[PDB]
Structure formats: C-alpha cells, structure tokens
Design a protein around this ligand. Sequence first.
Ligand SMILES: O=C(O)CCC(=O)C(=O)O
Ligand SMILES: O=C(O)CCC(=O)C(=O)O
Ligand SMILES: [K+]
Ligand SMILES: [K+]
Ligand SMILES: [K+]
Ligand SMILES: [K+]
Ligand SMILES: [K+]
Ligand SMILES: [K+]
Ligand SMILES: [K+]
Ligand SMILES: [K+]
Ligand SMILES: [K+]
Ligand SMILES: [K+]
Ligand SMILES: [K+]
Ligand SMILES: [K+]
Lengths: 193, 193
Amino acid sequence: TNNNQIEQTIFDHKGNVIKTEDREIQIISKFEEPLIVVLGNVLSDEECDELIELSKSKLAAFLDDNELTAKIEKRISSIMNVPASHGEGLHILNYEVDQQYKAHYDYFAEHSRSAANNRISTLVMYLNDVEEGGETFFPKLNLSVHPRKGMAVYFEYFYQDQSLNELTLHGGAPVTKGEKWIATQWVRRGTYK
Amino acid sequence: TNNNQIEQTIFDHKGNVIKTEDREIQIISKFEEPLIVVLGNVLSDEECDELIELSKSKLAAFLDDNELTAKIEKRISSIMNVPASHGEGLHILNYEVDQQYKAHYDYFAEHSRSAANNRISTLVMYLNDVEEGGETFFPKLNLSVHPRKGMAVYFEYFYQDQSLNELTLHGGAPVTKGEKWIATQWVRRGTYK
Ligand SMILES: O=C(O)CCC(=O)C(=O)O
Ligand SMILES: O=C(O)CCC(=O)C(=O)O
Ligand SMILES: [K+]
Ligand SMILES: [K+]
Ligand SMILES: [K+]
Ligand SMILES: [K+]
Ligand SMILES: [K+]
Ligand SMILES: [K+]
Ligand SMILES: [K+]
Ligand SMILES: [K+]
Ligand SMILES: [K+]
Ligand SMILES: [K+]
Ligand SMILES: [K+]
Ligand SMILES: [K+]
C-alpha cells in the first residue's frame, strides 16, 4: 500500500524513452503538475487489434487473463512504476459516433467503499485511430490528448495537496466520425490482485 | 500583415489530423491557451536526414532554397495556417552533448527594429532522436515536449492579452546523451519573403 506521507510523483521516468523488458516506450510530452505524460509506441498495432478482438469475442468490460494481457500488464507496470498486482486489469471501452465520457475523476469518492483501496494513477491506451473526435481532455488544465493508435496518456492523482488531484478532471470527447477503442489500466493504492 | 484587432488563434485545425496536400499530419496533444500543439508525422525520416545533410554540406543556419525546402515550407504553411511568404525559411540547429538553449521568447523586443514585422508563431521540427535530454520546455506552463524524429511542436504568440504571449517562454533543455537536430520555422506578422 503506497504512502505519500513525505510532493513526489509515482512516475519517475527520466529522459525520452522507457526501456521496458519487451519494448522501448517513447516519452512525447509531459505536463508536470499534476503529472500527465503522453507516451508513444506503448502497444504494437497487432496488440491493439487483438485487445479489440478479445473484447468483441467476450461481448458475444475487463478482459480475461490470458498471456497477452499478462504481457501487457507487465509492460504497463514498468511504465506506471507500480507492480501489476495493483492494476484492476485491462478494461476495454468502445465509443461509437455520438458517444462520449463526460468530465469526471478516476479516484473514488472518499465516503465510498471502493475508496478503501483507492486508485492513484491511470493509463489510457488508444487501440485504434479515430477519424474525428474522441480526445482525452482535461477541462481545468485546458489540455487535450488526441487518440493515436499505439499511443497512451498517463496521469496520476496521488498528491498530498488535494487541489492537484482535483485538476486531473478529465473525459473522453464525443466521437463525431468513426469509432474509438481504448484500453485503460487503473492502479490502486494497495494490492488489488 | 495579420491583424488580431477583434481572442482567436491563427492555428484553426480541428480534429485529429491535418490533411496537407502531400502528407497527413497527426495532432497528438493541445495545450489550448496559449496554443501549443504537438504534431506527429510532420516530416518523413528521409526528409529529416536530408535537412541534416543539407545543413552539414552548407556548414563546410538558414538553408538555401531548393525543391526540398520549398516543398516542406508549403506543407508547414498548411499546418501553421499562414502563407509561406511569412516564414523566415528553414533554420537548422544542432545541439551536441552539453549544449542547450535557455528560456527565451521568439517574438522580438518591442523597441527592436525586427519588431516592425514581428514573429507570431513558431514550429520546431525534430530531425533526429535524442538519446537523453533536449526537450522543448515551457517553464511558466510546467510543460515539456520531448524530441522525437518526425514530430514537431507548434506554438503561437499573437494574443491581444500580452500575459498569454508571455507564457510562451521556452527553451531547449541540455542534451546529456547523443545529439539533437531541429528545424525551425518562424512566421512573421507580415510578408517576409
Ligand atoms: O476516452 C478517453 O479518452 C478517456 C478514457 C477514460 O476516461 C477511461 O477509460 O478511464
Ligand atoms: O531546442 C528546442 O527544443 C527548442 C528550439 C527553439 O527554441 C528554436 O529553434 O526556436
Ligand atoms: K491493423
Ligand atoms: K466498465
Ligand atoms: K457514502
Ligand atoms: K491547496
Ligand atoms: K467513416
Ligand atoms: K463498431
Ligand atoms: K535515418
Ligand atoms: K541562427
Ligand atoms: K531599442
Ligand atoms: K492580463
Ligand atoms: K551515445
Ligand atoms: K554531431
């Protein structure tokens, strides 16, 4: 269970690359406080296509644990700097035209029961190219990340100053053309298994 | 000569792509005010290598006008939304290890003679991958863009509120490993030819 009692960030990667065990991840841009990092080459095109197909074959939502998800969760754990036992698992979302996710927080309300082991960081991976729309936007920061296949946006909200955590308000913009496929890894403060 | 007398941005591209005449440019992220846009697939790897070689063959600095520079300046003009006659031309810079560009503004001081036709926007294109360091950082915004071959960072400073223009303070971080090659297009308020 993480402890921020003496302002630091969980993500501690320096430089322009993250050399994971099976892939070299690109660091594209950083908004430092609260920490929002745009990452390139997080997933290959083949991995993006298969997470989409796995979500479709299960629909006929969190994915079931095979060898692809475990491989990606280990690579994600190197990126987010938290062991994979904190991750809720790969959650796959699909936005058709005219669908969106309005602005919200990822950490749970303090009075909620899920806040006992609350989330601390999020990684959103873009599994396909969106013809128009579907950007990840942060209203209080006037910042948006646009979907691009293989890329991802990282942001954390484990600050002592709650003002910094409240700036991580974000949503998914309406898809106007095409469709949007994303994979999301939420990281809990403690072991989630 | 541009006129902002009735707050709008010169860059007006919507969506996730910029369909220029010879290339589809990716919109990666946007910091909206002041407008800073991270762009992908701005230059091919072959174009990046040749602008570097052209700078080296001229050293033995602004490049001379051939067909490659005119082709890129036309593509850049579609991105920056200003005719190429406003551009100063492709300026190539090389940072070795232990070299940097400290924080500064791109528009000239108001009492300077170059401020008669002052700059309004800048595009910085990364011509190679930097092993470590060399990020384009904006201190007053706590934002940095890291170098990635083929990508570019766009930002403009033609706002009526001078507070917004003064937030475009930026520099090139010290290169600690490898080297950094960039192409820069500065756009003047009026025709520069
Ligand atoms: O659609 C987006 O870009 C944001 C996705 C998101 O908010 C999430 O899955 O946690
Ligand atoms: O080195 C950088 O990333 C910034 C380049 C720059 O400031 C310029 O060429 O105008
Ligand atoms: K594909
Ligand atoms: K869900
Ligand atoms: K309650
Ligand atoms: K506060
Ligand atoms: K379509
Ligand atoms: K569909
Ligand atoms: K090359
Ligand atoms: K110069
Ligand atoms: K003067
Ligand atoms: K002001
Ligand atoms: K080296
Ligand atoms: K060199």
